[PDB]
Amino acid sequence: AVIFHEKTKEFHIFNREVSYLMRIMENGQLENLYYGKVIRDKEDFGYLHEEAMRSQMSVCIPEPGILSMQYTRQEYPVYGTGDYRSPALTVLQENGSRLVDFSYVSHEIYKGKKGIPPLPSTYAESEDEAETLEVTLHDQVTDTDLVLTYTIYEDYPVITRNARFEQKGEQKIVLERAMSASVEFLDMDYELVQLSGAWSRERYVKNRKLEMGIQSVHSLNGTCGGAEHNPFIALKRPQTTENQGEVYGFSLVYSGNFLAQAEVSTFDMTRVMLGINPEDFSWELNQGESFQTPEVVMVYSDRGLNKMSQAYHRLYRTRLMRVTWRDKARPILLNNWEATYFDFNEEKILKIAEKAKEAGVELFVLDDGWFGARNDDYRGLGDWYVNLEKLPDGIAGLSRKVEALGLKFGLWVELEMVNKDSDLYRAHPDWLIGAPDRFESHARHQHVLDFSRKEVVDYIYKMIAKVLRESSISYIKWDMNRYMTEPYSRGADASQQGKVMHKYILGVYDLYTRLTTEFPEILFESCASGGARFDPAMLYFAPQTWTSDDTDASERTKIQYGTSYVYPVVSMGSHVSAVPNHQMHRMTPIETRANVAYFGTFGYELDLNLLSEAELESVKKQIAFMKEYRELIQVDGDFYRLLSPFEGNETAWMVVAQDKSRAVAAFYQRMNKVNASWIRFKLQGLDAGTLYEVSCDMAPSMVKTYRAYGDELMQVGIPIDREDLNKKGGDFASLLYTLKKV
Amino acid sequence: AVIFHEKTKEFHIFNREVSYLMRIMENGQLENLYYGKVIRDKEDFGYLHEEAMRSQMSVCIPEPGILSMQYTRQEYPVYGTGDYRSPALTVLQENGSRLVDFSYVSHEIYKGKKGIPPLPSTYAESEDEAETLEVTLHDQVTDTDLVLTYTIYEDYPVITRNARFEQKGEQKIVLERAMSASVEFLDMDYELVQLSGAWSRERYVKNRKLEMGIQSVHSLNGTCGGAEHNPFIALKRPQTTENQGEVYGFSLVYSGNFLAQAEVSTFDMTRVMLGINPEDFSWELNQGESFQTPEVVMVYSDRGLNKMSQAYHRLYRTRLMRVTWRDKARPILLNNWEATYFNEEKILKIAEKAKAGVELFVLDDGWFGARNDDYRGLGDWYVNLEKLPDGIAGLSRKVEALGLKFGLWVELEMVNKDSDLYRAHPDWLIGAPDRFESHARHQHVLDFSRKEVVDYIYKMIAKVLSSISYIKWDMNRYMTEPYSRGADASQQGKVMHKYILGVYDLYTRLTTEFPEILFESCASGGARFDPAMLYFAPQTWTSDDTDASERTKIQYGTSYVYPVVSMGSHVSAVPNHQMHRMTPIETRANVAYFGTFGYELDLNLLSEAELESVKKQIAFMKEYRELIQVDGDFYRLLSPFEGNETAWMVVAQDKSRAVAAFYQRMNKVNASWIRFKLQGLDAGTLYEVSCDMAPSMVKTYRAYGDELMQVGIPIDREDLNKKGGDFASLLYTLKKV
Amino acid sequence: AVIFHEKTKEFHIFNREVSYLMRIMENGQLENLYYGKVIRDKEDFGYLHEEAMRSQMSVCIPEPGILSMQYTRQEYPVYGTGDYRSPALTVLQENGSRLVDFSYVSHEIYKGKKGIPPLPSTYAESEDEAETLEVTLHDQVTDTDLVLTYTIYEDYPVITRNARFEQKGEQKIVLERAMSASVEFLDMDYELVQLSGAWSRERYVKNRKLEMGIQSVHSLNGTCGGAEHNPFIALKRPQTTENQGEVYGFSLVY
Amino acid sequence: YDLYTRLTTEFPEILFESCASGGARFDPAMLYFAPQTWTSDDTDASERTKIQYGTSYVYPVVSMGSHVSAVPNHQMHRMTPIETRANVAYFGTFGYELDLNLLSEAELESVKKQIAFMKEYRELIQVDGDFYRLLSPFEGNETAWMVVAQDKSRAVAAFYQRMNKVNASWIRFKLQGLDAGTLYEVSCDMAPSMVKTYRAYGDELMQVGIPIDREDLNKKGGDFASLLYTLKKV
């Protein structure tokens, strides 16, 4: 509950777990007085905020008082009044100046969380799920108005922050830089945690030690956040493992360019900011206009990384996903991409679907190569009508046939790229992104379409709506395969060019808002050559994402471990692939592929009419196993990480029911060893005092079962023979253990 | 030399200890192939470029080719054409686009070194010490021109780089960011070093390990380079301490805002960049206008930190400082700051009593206008007559008669609200309409970006300059509210750089008029200690802390890039006014020797025992000054960091003399046997180590050069109790038999 | 309390904080199963032991068995019967041999704490404050008795150990090594703590990471323990601080 | 052992102290006849600061013998403020080892109030109290102990310094041992070589701590100084 003490001008933000503290300075600026574990509310916290005299210290109050911003923890810093660190805001007037001074005016208080129109954010279904405060600041040299919002969630240790700007004078301004968050700490004995990777290597967990200077991650891709750095930042004490210790986590809800920075000054202070990347960003507000910035979610944990990740999972799964697909399971599908690629026909698709129906697959998805020419990857992408020479009947015929068989239908789309061999290039050549006399940049022989303008979006919607309505698709895979280059918009004036790379992202949002409204029964999945656009946004639109194009059980273990720090289990896509890998060219048991793909959205990518009888009855059995444990793995249960692919060659996962009545756990190893030490496998998150029946199957490439109390598996753990792992394949073995309360 | 292979289109610039190699791409853009230890010449080095097909890769040549700037090692990068990292050059055209396509035209090779017009740099004295390559690049969409200049020295493994822009068309462009140099490698197994600290804590050594992302040091101060971060970074292998290993060092010749960053991508590739901070910098070239960027000096050593620092010292003492003071050794002075904080006879007895052996005297602030406090007028540069009834000329002569010399103290670009100039020119400050002005130390900052203020100050200062032989120029503030009143909206991004240029030109005038005065820089205790200003002032007041145990660390940190002669050190009273610690005279003198020697105490209120200790040490300095400063190679032996001892040693250039020191901080009981391994002697030469082991007798034996390297010099923990307890130090003199 | 399972021959020692499990092997020797946080009692816990087949492994039982000492957690090791690690007991016989093999005979349980007569030790006032277990091992070729004592306190996670020797035979045996206790685990992720110093620098704390081999502190002074090494030792997890983590402490009363 | 045995069995009303050239025989076996031991012949505050920290892992605070020595030290040859010596010597067995005829009432009035303080708090420091170590003399130059009562109604803290820092950072002194919610009165003595007193809840002192000024540590010995805090329930 937010509380205001009038005499001292303090704002207290606190629920049962976290606590915040602010104060009005001698100016109209705010200060940070505390951020962390909850404390008892007491008035006059003013003995905090010490101050003293130092050499060459520039102050910004009248003659007898000295107060420099260099030595105080401000909320929304500026540069030009005495602070020589990095700023967070920058404004240009008509005098050529960049000097601003926002002062406090008033505040508003209420309950529940409101919405920010142009951008997606979390919500609150009831009026008693959150509480919010709004602080307003005014400027007098230029009639600018600034608003800062603070939301606290009840029953969850999360605080949400954003900002807003309004112009109500008669002078135009330029916003060259405007971050979304800024939080400051006194000491520096922290470590920085980030997720860094690349194509088929996304989101590896990396640690750094804080030092004097600046340390940052950023993206300059324009179209997406890219595969290199993921918009998520953590601070953790060096003595904080996954079962205990303190940690702060910051996550940004936005899908384009971003910057996350931590600066440590010489006097040991730390400052962290998250927001848009001010590379080529310059908004150009006039009278009566406005500007809203993406929001940031902050989580504090006092018990290790698992608690913070679980809070992120539950919030993103309940209060961010859409109501329709929030608390429902996910289907088992089959994709024919890797099985046939560009070469296929109607009857081949029917044969594959007929075999898959016998196996038990629930729906069939048709991949690239059903439109335009599509002989190679050089031909028409803007032509979104069915090919007739290669499919004589059309999409409606295939949909009705595969519905008669007993399966559901789905399609693949890439709605924002065009080729030099499409109809739109000859029709409307000047609908691309580029500038005069500038060389075009080709990636996979394709170019990027200009969604800065509504005219192109209407044209794309006209075809997508009419191809979806005259057919029975219930699953759409939206794709993306390019990075943006030469950001120029040929439908804007010379003074509106600093919004292009931003407005493009907006164009990609509202199109979704159309398709998900007209068609509310279609399930969506975002994909960008793997996990290149995988972020807290688009969980508002597409409740699952294709994690990577790797599909290797020896690699997806490491990728999912790194990915599961902030994102829930339900939204991570995963598939079972052919035995000789197209990426590593490795060999892997079917058992371990099934074990790895269980945690996520189960599926298939191979051809089911090409295997052997023993390797097919196992497919049927694992489909049944997923059909049984799907709702425990996905809808009801908390994720726990036990061992890590980093600093080792073993991995271990587990999900437990909320009432501690069921659990499934897994053990994986990467290489093999002889004469090795004994193994004890220690579990987590169970209930001590409950007699659990641990079961496992040890069929080579019989079933063991024994009863043990909750605490014994906690401290002692299950013993694992290294000969059993050598009869389940040596290099990449794995063992799935199931528990029940009886 | 510099060699061009025209059939393969490659540049090779080699030395006796370093080589650089570049190649003109299939475009008109430059790629780096090698930068390191010298390599043998050869034609067709073209197999060192590697291209692969990868997903999400943007190509910038026609369709049947692949070349992506995000996987290449380029020289002056640009954003928005397939490269997705932080660029080096940004420009805003009238269309609103920030896209350019600079391409190659031609080049020129000439021996010698040309001067940068509005900026200071190094120099050569004959067409036999350096050879320069200039490469011209041209943009066609905008009629712009670019130049890159690389200079290679002889007898030193140093390479200098700088760029230049020239607009030669009809349109107008705006340079929103323009660095000086960018360097790329293939590996990320390095460590970044930096010199960080604060007031009275200057330049501590700090090491950081590179990890995927960005790590940097910045400066937003307008007036000076700051006491927090210095313009010097270096990359070292993890196994390199002082005597073996590789290290690269980069240094920037500039005095204002800077940025120095290292960025490592996800494919194990490092780019390092230096230059002016692009925070509020936006230069606005019109037709026919030009822009020059500050120089960058790079040094490479395969022996370690000592070789790199000894190259830096010998380069900055021989080809940077002015010729007149290039040989002469610095004198011993006495300042009165600590003795009296703010009076003629009192500054005439001190002069005579110091005339002990002191060579000259200098007057501190408080001799002008009112200046009864730190509240009165700095804008008045005429002599106060209440304190000095005879002015300055009478005081100067009554001091110069005895044999001493004279020097004064000035602070030329700060103004107080209680001055004559503020009553005569209230709009001559720095500030903006409707905004509050920050007050620091009850003084404000003038506007050197204009010209009439420089002249107005120059007339007054040139008038008062008596029989002066030494001037101390001080600065005591940071810059806030950076807005000018003699400009319009189109030129408000040039104020902070024109401030530095207007600081430089006053130095130029005052030095050119009076070439017989020794200047010493000071910025509230060395907050402007940078490779610039050695062009003008050959020494600087490194810090105000003046404590032996603290200077033991600050001087070790500073000695990474800067020489010894330029490090101003003094001797202060016993209970030091900052830390409030006790320390004997002998160790204070031992600390103060290395550098330029001086004094900051009264000599009265000093007992008879110490007054004879301060005539013997002045005699020692008068004999070893020319070895310590002019002819000597510095060696760092033990670090105050990473331990609890310190050791320096200066050697002569033909291996004939040496002076060594050993400092310790806290006393130790039941400790271990100490050895003292020297560095830089000649193995096949006997010597005669000698240390006066007095209380608070001399041991003088003879031993070969290698015995004093592999074995060491035994030190007795009992000899460390006679010469005080904590903060006890020893001094050694070695001379060939 | 103190519990013995007749069917499986296990001893369970526990209070509200700590827990200790012991089993009698197929020989008379005692083996370790668990030492740590408290557990709920269960009738049997045999699988906690593990045995496999390796190369160059020596067996101490008739041929069908595969039991080996080099790969077991034993409570009082001896050398020359299969183990190639540092022993904790050594004797010399009139024949000049060094080999012994003590086997389980009997055990006794009671409430309280008897004190070793010639040496100082801790005590207890009431009879509910501690509980004691004595295990007797006998040697046959040399009529010798070994008595191992285990005491658990209450309200404190403290367990006390010692060993006593008796000679009821007729010949002469020479004790050339006899330690007081030996505790063995299954993993090596620990740091060792010690207190080292000298005159007027006594007991400076030092930490050292465990590595394959032997690390040991010692005193050879004769008149006193000495200022160099204090008779103490502690094993801690790497992530252990003053307020969180796991640690074991061993203190010797001598 | 049997010499100790007979000597203590014949005379049971005597206190026997054990010393081996400065605590070279400090073992759990020498505390069943002699209940206290002379820790070290250094007696220097800046050295006993580190020595007692290492000692306190296994032996109680009562057995640690402490003394106040001559201010020009005989082992380290160092000058230290008198209140710091007292503060370091409190956490053990108090006592002096100097002549009380070589001091001024300006130094000997402090002794008459140090003795009063120790006589007031010795039943809390020695008999009934749990020892918490907060900061370590290793990896840094700050030390902090603390004593709390089992009733969790009173406590005593201590903060120590080795060197002095100029233009340094801020200081929050976090302590543990108290209870979650219980209003506490915190006091401190302020002399230039008078009394601060505020109130705070138990958890504020733990997560947030106690503010420390660096000019209030540069008045009680610049290079070497120490602070003492008393906490009472009320």
TrEMBL record, chain A:
- Enumerate the residues binding substrate: W199, D367, D368, R444, K477, W478, D479, M480, N481, C527, D549
GO BP field: carbohydrate catabolic process
Q: Provide this UniProt record's keywords sorted from A to Z.
A: Glycosidase, Hydrolase
Q: What is this protein called?
A: Alpha-galactosidase
The organism named in the record is Blautia pseudococcoides
Residue ranges constituting the Glycosyl hydrolase family 36 C-terminal domain according to the UniProt record = 650-739
Give the family per the record.
Answer: Belongs to the glycosyl hydrolase.
EC number(s) per UniProt? 3.2.1.22
Key word Lipid metabolism present: no
Q: Where is the Glycosyl hydrolase family 36 N-terminal domain?
A: 28-286
**Which GO molecular-function terms appear in the entry?**
alpha-galactosidase activity
Q: Which residues form the active site?
A: D479 (nucleophile), D549 (proton donor)
Record's keyword annotation contains Hydrolase: yes
Spell out the InterPro entries in the cross-references. Answer: Aldolase_TIM (IPR013785), Alpga-gal_N_sf (IPR038417), Alpha-glycosidase_related (IPR050985), GH (IPR017853), Glyco_hydro_27/36_CS (IPR000111), Glyco_hydro_36 (IPR002252), Glyco_hydro_36_C (IPR031705), Glyco_hydro_36_N (IPR031704)
